[PDB]
Amino acid sequence: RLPEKNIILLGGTVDSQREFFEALSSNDRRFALGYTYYDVLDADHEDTLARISIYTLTDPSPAFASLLQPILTPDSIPNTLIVILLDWSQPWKWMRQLREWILLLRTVLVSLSHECKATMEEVMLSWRDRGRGGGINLDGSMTLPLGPGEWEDGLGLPLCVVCQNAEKMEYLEKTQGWKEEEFDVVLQFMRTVLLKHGASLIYTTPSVPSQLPSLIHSSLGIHSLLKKQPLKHNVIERDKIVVPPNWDSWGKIRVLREGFDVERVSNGWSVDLDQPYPLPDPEGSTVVLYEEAVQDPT
């Protein structure tokens, strides 16, 4: 009888998915995809607001991706969030991993019924203003034209990217010589491509409290009857990044550090996503730009 919400959880490992689940549901909780769920409590830890179902796909398999079809119906689509897990142990892999998941996901979404696609268009239209500072809160409850890059590439569903094990940033600083400005460049690259999908970005560390529950629950359209504090965005304190939807812009991305060609990187992401799924990297690719900038210690 509870409102039902879905998370489609992509990537990670067995342990990092479980860590995601704990981080997500710690405070405010009471041939197949992995499955679990939990009941979300309101901010006083009393009343139950929604039941969140999580469907998990660790690897970008086309076979198992097909299992998403039955989960995405006209009724479920407006209640669904895509979450991609990335790992701070291997940030050099991020842009390529992200491209693969998005191409995979697109393959599923174009295959849904006309009614599903009409519903996804409705969802995308309504997301334009959610949490944008005008009339509409991030959670979809009520209270200027779009900058460049913003929502140029709506997926049909909202996306949240969660970069796990951020304690490994300190590891890269001390054993691989990474400087503050290298973490910032990663951030500029991620913010730029994700902006095109209207997507959020958040870094987490196991056992370190974060805004992950508030971000995910608000993105799922779960409306607190007690709390009106909005999300707190951060792009400065490097291991606690929080970039909520409809907050970022090229203007903001460009000032983090100098020398970042935001438009080139945004156009390179068009090059990357205009490709069949599932050999060589196309001219202008942002995966290539990223992988030149963020090198693998091989």
Author numbering: 44 to 73, 89 to 201, 211 to 345, 375 to 394
Give the original sentences from the paper that presented this experimental model:
Cytoplasmic dynein is a large homodimer that consists of a heavy chain (>500 kDa) and several smaller associated subunits, each present in two copies. The heavy chain ‘tail’ domain binds the associated subunits, which include the intermediate chain (IC), the light intermediate chain (LIC), and the light chains (LC): Tctex1, LC8, and LC7/roadblock. The LIC subunits, which are present in all cytoplasmic dyneins described thus far but absent from axonemal dyneins, are thought to play important roles in cargo transport. Interestingly, the C-terminal half of the protein is involved in binding Rab effectors, whereas the G domain is the docking site for the dynein heavy chain.
In this study, we report the crystal structure of the conserved N-terminal domain of the LIC from a thermophilic hyphal fungus, Chaetomium thermophilum, and show that it is composed of a canonical G protein fold. The LIC structure revealed a central β-sheet flanked by α-helices, which in comparison with other protein structures in the Protein Data Bank (PDB) using the Dali server, is most similar to the G domain of small GTP-binding proteins. Like Ras, the prototype of small G proteins, LIC has six β-strands in the core of the structure (five parallel and one anti-parallel) as well as five similarly placed α-helices. In addition to the five-α-helices found in Ras, the LIC G domain has two-α-helical insertions (α-helix 3a and 4a) that extend from the core of the structure. The LIC G domain also has three additional α-helices at the C-terminus (α-helix 6, 7, and 8) that interact with the core G domain structure and has a short seventh β-strand that extends the β-sheet. However, unlike most small GTP-binding proteins, the nucleotide pocket is empty, the P-loop exhibits a closed conformation and our biochemical experiments confirm that the fungal LIC G domain does not bind nucleotide. Relatively few universally conserved residues are on the surface of the LIC G domain, with the exception of a hydrophobic groove of universally conserved residues composed of three aromatic residues (Y93, Y95 [β2], and Y113 [β3]) and Leu125 (α2) (residue numbers refer to the position in C. thermophilum LIC). In contrast, the other five double or triple mutations tested bound normally to the dynein heavy chain.
